[PDB]
């Protein structure tokens, strides 16, 4: 009877999934994107529920779950 919020993805065509670890910040999961894909760091938005993600935010602070984040433009 508790709230479940439950988000369900059409496909996920593209999605990347990264081994962090909890002392990553957000910026390193950024410098990691762009190691692996070339997408530059500099143009990277990371979005979680809706609120962009700062850079210095430790991941480990945002959780074990597992975390989604989407990478938006502008």
């Known amino acids: 009877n508790r709230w479940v919020p439950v988000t369900v993805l059409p496909g ?3 999605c990347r999934t990264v ?11 950024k410098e990691r994107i762009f190691a692996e894909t ?3 760091v500099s143009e990277q938005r990371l979005w ?3 609120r962009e993600l700062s850079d210095w935010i430790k991941i480990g602070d945002l959780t ?10 502008k």
């Open 19 to 29: 081994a962090a670890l909890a002392s990553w910040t957000v910026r390193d999961v």
């Open 38 to 40: 070339g997408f530059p």
């Open 64 to 73: 074990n779950c597992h975390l989604f984040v989407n990478l938006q433009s």
């Open 12 to 14: 996920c065509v593209g």
């Open 48 to 50: 979680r529920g809706g």
